[PDB]
């Protein structure tokens, strides 16, 4: 599945992501862009058995369980499958722990690179939230 900038922005908001840990919606919608471009099935093998899943590219070592990853901690208490879906409940909430782990959104390199410091507002501009 692929979400529309607003479609996603809506869901993200409907599952308390706005300002969470001080991060405003703009940041989570942009985050999803340069990460999966709103594509639920965007997987990515890593030279470390880890595989990043979902819109937000959540790793399978610490936060997710897929079976095939050695050193698994499953902190989000969730099977990776859940990050590949028509809804972001599992992805939104499971992202809440990640952003709550130290350095903010810098957990998402694409965000640090294409979003840290811009006027994220643009990304929700037109979306009736």
């Amino acid at each position: 599945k692929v979400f529309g900038r607003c479609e996603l922005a809506a869901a993200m908001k409907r599952h308390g992501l706005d300002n969470y840990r001080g991060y405003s919606l703009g940041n989570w919608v942009c985050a999803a862009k340069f990460e999966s471009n709103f594509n639920s099935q965007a997987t990515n093998r890593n030279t470390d058995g880890s595989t990043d899943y979902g819109v937000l590219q959540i790793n399978s070592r610490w936060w997710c369980n897929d079976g095939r990853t050695p050193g698994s901690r499953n902190l989000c208490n969730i099977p990776c499958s859940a990050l590949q879906s028509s809804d972001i409940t599992a992805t939104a909430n499971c992202a809440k722990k990640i952003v709550s782990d130290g350095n903010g959104m810098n957990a998402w390199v694409a965000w640090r690179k294409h979003c840290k410091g811009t006027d994220v507002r643009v990304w929700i501009k037109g979306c009736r939230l």
Partner: antibody, heavy 122, light 108 residues
């Protein structure tokens, strides 16, 4: 400045249910996860649950999946644990706590509550 | 779940001796070990996080160590409020599991 108030005692008849309550203050309620540990009589502490206030998202301990039911109320800044069908064995001191200052990967609960000693008796 | 065992349920020594509380987990939880003090008062307080990092506020007396399956809290000069029970918990994964405790007592 991070304060989980919590009612000290709570008498409960068996077969009934009690809704314990933990009220926060000193930080932004919804932006932090709430934790609850039980202390069985003459035993260790048992991690029973987790809940995110913002999207009201519980994270259970397989064991208690059915006894405890996490819930929260934002307008009041208060987490609630509801012990369903209370029984003899399930009488003890129940703590609410938080994951605040430390990185989620450390699982370090810090800033705990005082306690609620539920006593099941008819 | 991960079994957190503390072999000695009560330990005694005198106000000025060093005390060493043990804690051994089932699998390598890679330094994700925390120590909590439960005073007879009822309140619980964080003393050390991540094996040896003193939580802010604790007296340098408390010392943390270990790494792997074995860990331990070591109080240097046992004192007044130190007489309580000590728990260890793991952070490595869900569900979180804490040790059964170790109750200190003044040796007579």
């Amino acid at each position: 400045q991070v304060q989980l108030q919590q009612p000290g005692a709570e008498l409960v008849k068996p077969g009934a249910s009690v809704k314990l309550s933990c009220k926060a203050s000193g930080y932004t309620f919804t932006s932090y996860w709430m934790h609850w540990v039980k202390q069985g009589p003459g035993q260790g502490l048992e991690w029973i649950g987790e809940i995110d206030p913002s999207d009201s998202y519980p994270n259970y301990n397989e064991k208690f999946k059915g006894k405890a039911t996490l819930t929260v109320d934002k307008s009041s800044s208060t987490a609630y644990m509801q012990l369903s069908s209370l029984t003899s064995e399930d009488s003890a001191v129940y703590y609410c706590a938080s994951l605040y200052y430390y990185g989620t990967s450390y699982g370090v609960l810090d800033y705990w509550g005082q306690g609620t000693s539920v006593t099941v008796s008819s | 779940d991960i079994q957190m065992t503390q072999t000695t349920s009560s330990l005694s020594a005198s106000l000025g001796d060093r005390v060493t509380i043990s804690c051994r987990a089932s699998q390598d939880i890679s330094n994700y070990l925390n120590w909590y003090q439960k005073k007879p008062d009822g309140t619980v307080k964080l003393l050390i996080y991540y094996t040896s990092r003193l939580h802010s506020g604790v007296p340098s007396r408390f010392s943390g160590s270990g790494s792997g399956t074995d860990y331990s809290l070591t109080i240097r000069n046992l004192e007044q409020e130190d007489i309580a029970t000590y728990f260890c918990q793991q952070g490595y994964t869900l569900p979180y599991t804490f040790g059964g405790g170790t109750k200190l007592e003044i040796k007579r």
